[PDB]
Symmetry: D2
Subunit: 276 residues, 4 copies
């Protein structure tokens, strides 16, 4: 009774007839993996789930990122608590693909809607696959093969740390650990083989094989193009919603329009491999 | 009974518990009027209506438009049939405010969904009001009081329409009937007094008081800014949905991602006055 | 004898030691032709000439264009009088390659400075050859082979000329006689074989093999790139100067900073062939 | 006989009939000063001078900046040596106003041409006074009173000097000692009272009173606007040339199109005050 309902041609599907708060069968797991590989972002409603059950579900689709440093559920360091009462989430109101400044950016995440404002706070997703397919041939030919630099300081500039000398040293220290690195501009999905634009406003600073000026123009083009209505969907949250997206070929945008209302989410991140 | 559920802080509400296939009470009409003034675009689901019913409901909020040349219902001259089998709708996939090239652009419209593709074909709306209020003070200050040229030919260029030296007669005649005219860049709603950005990439060509080079840069900015996620919503159609929007302070976008599948909408347009 | 002093690495050269008011020798002609093929735009100071001599000189380098109605010298329908007291030149203050909306844009022109303001009215030239060569390999790979639309209406909007029943018929006839056409984005010089960027902000409206959106970004990039200082020169005019440029691989820009002072130039235009 | 020859309406003048290898009379000093205030950038040809003579001249127009490290010139540290054999000048091929990241950017500079390549290495100057006046009134009104951040790391980013650990703590301290700071977008010349645009692509990163998105669009507009031909001049150097410009209301650009040929200039910087 596992049911997959596509939400739009470019990406997105809703799933029902499966209780992911319990161990799912092999068949169900594989049915959802296929849906992910096809639709890239999956939604389930009326699916309450605790962090332990959320981790047990996400771990079925890859290894989980362990964290004791970020806002965690004490019992499960595999599930991250996102609380607007504790952490400002304003910088999520930008198109981004998660941790693309890493050598192996996250495979994806399972997100749980715990506490929501009456309304507002939508999240959008955009398909790198659909976006890439819609580019003109000559543009696809040129970009496929090129590489781009990703740098965490684009989303975490010096001013976001502090104007104090020790805030400056912290910024230099985290920079040493996460120096700028490169990924293909057109990424081949490691499972499905589907090609996708793999730059995002959050982290992409430079198309390496173009000049600074040429790069600025192309990236501004690609940033605007890839986030067009044709390549995206918009989710209006309800409590107990669950979202499961493939971070290897999407970007997303957390609309910040509900301050100072409290919003609480739970996140489990699935580890990814090297983009090629 | 009648309930009004906001969909987003910027714009949009859903109304249910009111049967608009039958005459609505003066109180219902007034409630919906206020909802429109507040939320700018209203949605009702599971609301089947024939053309005649659609017209008397629409007529409750202003005078309806009679169009003889465009495809409409035989007996109801004021309800327009939008059928993808008959007419192509590719150029609706562009942020536009309806007929802003006229001295008195449409007040708004009532739209009914008759026949829908299995999925796809979402429509987005954007609040000129929310967009304006989100601009910096120095920008609101400079823009408020300026005027802008709206040109029919920007959506209906020569190569796209008037494709024959025989059809060109139809172009030269319309280009001669609807010359470029101007409207305030910042419009004051004629009923609520709420101020809204009143430009759209669909018809706006030039900010009159700025130079060509200046205007181009400002419009590129405003076009991007006014359609950011913060100021918009996305509606996934279901048959028998009704949409009711205020075309005096909004823009909309009809995603064309369902070709060649058939889509059929019915529209009643409400006449507006001069923007000031 | 003949002396050729390069002005800048990208383009431009001053020539001396030849009196072009008299018939030049074959060897001199060929020396100047070679300098044109190398330096693209040539300058001769202290070379007074009448229209008769200027036409005789120009004709040694290709067939001359004949235009009666356009302000010219009665004795020499080959030489055109450009007088700011008669014709507004405000529209030459934009980067353009001459008549690229024609299937055979001009080969070049020989220009003579008759009367000049005390100061101002500089003319700049840009090299399409140096600009193309400085592009990144990927960009050159992509552009080399594409085509672009050229349209005179980009520089001559109907709102610029024509209001009378005749004036409107005057425009529609011209537009009818000069439909948009295409030229290669990367032109191969039909003599030297050198490759040049062949788009200009004056006339180029669209790169054909790209979408409107993609084209728009690429042209803005190219318009800016091709006119950077690295690829251009700026001539400060003196009376009796003669300029001779290859219009097949350059753009130029006439600075209008001398109003209302009078400026009179004489121009002989050399017919060109089909760009490829 | 001190003679002043205006080169172009927007800015620039050539001065002759004065030997600046020797002391200048008060009458001359004041004439040059007035010429500086009117024309913003002054050029003298055939004026061979040595470091001592050059400092004596520049000192007549304000207090000179001392170069305490690696001088060059030993006996005259007020004169910096710019030799491409030792220093890469590629960075100067960008539109910039000198040290605007300092609270009191340089008043101006006296530059001497010691050794030049056969050709190439032109320098351009642009007038912020002429640029400001050419803006539309609405735009002049909005900008006049705003402030912009200047940051040296815009021109000198970390990846400009290497990961050599010495530079990691050495460069880190340079940013600590030169943090981002602000200046008026529209500067009032402290002597003449003439208003000028005071932003430059070199160091200006953000218009403060606007959002990042708005600032981005505006600065892109201004950067292009201020460097248009209308507002600029181009100087083709000769050995023994002297340039003397006002860095309070202009920006300049050094073309790097002569590598690897050797270029040697001597520079004397006049200290400036706080922009307002
Ligand atoms: O979108 C959400 O609500 C969570 C914040 C976010 O951007 C994410 O989890 O990646
Ligand atoms: O939403 C659609 O069906 C069409 C949207 C639109 O362009 C209109 O009918 O006003
Ligand atoms: O450049 C000139 O001197 C003005 C006329 C013009 O631009 C040209 O000759 O094409
Ligand atoms: O302009 C030059 O020739 C030297 C480099 C530069 O731009 C300067 O003097 O500031």
């Amino acid at each position: 009774s596992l049911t997959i309902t596509p939400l739009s041609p470019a990406l997105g599907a809703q799933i029902s007839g499966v209780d992911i708060s319990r161990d799912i069968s092999a068949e169900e797991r594989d049915a959802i993996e296929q849906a992910l590989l096809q639709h890239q972002v999956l939604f389930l409603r009326d699916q309450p789930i605790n962090p332990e059950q959320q981790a047990r579900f996400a771990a079925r689709f890859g290894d989980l990122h362990i964290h004791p440093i970020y806002p965690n559920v004490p019992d499960t360091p595999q599930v991250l608590v996102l609380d607007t009462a504790v952490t400002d989430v304003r910088d999520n109101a930008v198109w981004h693909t998660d941790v693309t400044f890493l050598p192996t950016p996250a495979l994806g995440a399972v997100l749980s809607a715990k506490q929501l404002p009456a309304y507002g706070g939508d999240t959008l997703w955009a398909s790198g696959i659909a976006a890439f397919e819609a580019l003109s041939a000559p543009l696809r030919e040129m970009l496929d093969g090129l590489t781009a630099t990703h740098d965490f300081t684009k989303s975490f500039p010096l001013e976001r740390f502090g104007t104090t000398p020790q805030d400056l040293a912290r910024w230099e220290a985290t920079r040493r650990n996460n120096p700028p690195l490169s990924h293909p501009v057109v990424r081949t999905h490691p499972v499905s083989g589907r090609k996708a634009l793999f730059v995002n406003e959050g982290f992409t600073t430079r198309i390496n094989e173009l000049s600074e000026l040429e790069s600025d123009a192309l990236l501004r083009l690609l940033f605007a193009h890839a986030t067009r209505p044709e390549f995206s969907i918009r989710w209006r949250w309800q409590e107990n919603d669950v979202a499961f997206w493939d971070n290897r070929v999407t970007q997303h945008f957390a609309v910040d329009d509900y301050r100072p209302n409290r919003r609480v989410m739970h996140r489990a991140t699935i580890l990814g491999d090297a983009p090629f």
